[PDB]
Design a binder for these strands. Sequence first.
RNA 1: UGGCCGGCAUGGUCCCAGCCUCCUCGCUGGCGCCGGCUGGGCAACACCAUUGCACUCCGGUGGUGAAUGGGAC
Length: 95
Amino acid sequence: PETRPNHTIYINNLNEKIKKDELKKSLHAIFSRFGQILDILVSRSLKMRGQAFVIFKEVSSATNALRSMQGFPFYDKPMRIQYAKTDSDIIAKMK
RNA sequence: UGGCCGGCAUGGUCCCAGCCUCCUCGCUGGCGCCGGCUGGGCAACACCAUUGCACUCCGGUGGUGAAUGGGAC
Ligand SMILES: [Tl+]
Ligand SMILES: [Tl+]
Ligand SMILES: [Tl+]
Ligand SMILES: [Tl+]
Ligand SMILES: [Tl+]
Ligand SMILES: [Tl+]
Ligand SMILES: [Tl+]
Ligand SMILES: [Tl+]
Ligand SMILES: [Tl+]
């Protein structure tokens, strides 16, 4: 069931008490050094809360981030990271 | 009061201060007691449920069942 490499990483187990806008800014803070980020998609709906899609421009970036930040304490919770199942439209509209 | 009716108590006007609050956060809002009818919203705050793969915002419930004193005429 393991996913294949993707420009986008999927993060979950994120503290749900954090507002969308702050969450996006914070995530960008810790993940930017891995490479250019095209966007970070967060939502608070029942189905999507506690998860986020950080979309990296280059898969290598999505790969260090995934290995380097796995389990990183963030807002008191261990961040769980994977590769997103399919592509993000921002990436389709290019690659 | 978010919108509305009743009961009771209470002389008036004004100044200061404190305080209160989901629905015009303040100095031309309110701040004796009690019952009842009933709308919006989850934006903020709180709580319940949720470990969930998206690229259209989008689960639920709760709060006003609130808050005092002094002074000048
Ligand atoms: Tl009311
Ligand atoms: Tl009355
Ligand atoms: Tl009097
Ligand atoms: Tl009086
Ligand atoms: Tl006031
Ligand atoms: Tl009443
Ligand atoms: Tl209501
Ligand atoms: Tl819908
Ligand atoms: Tl008084």
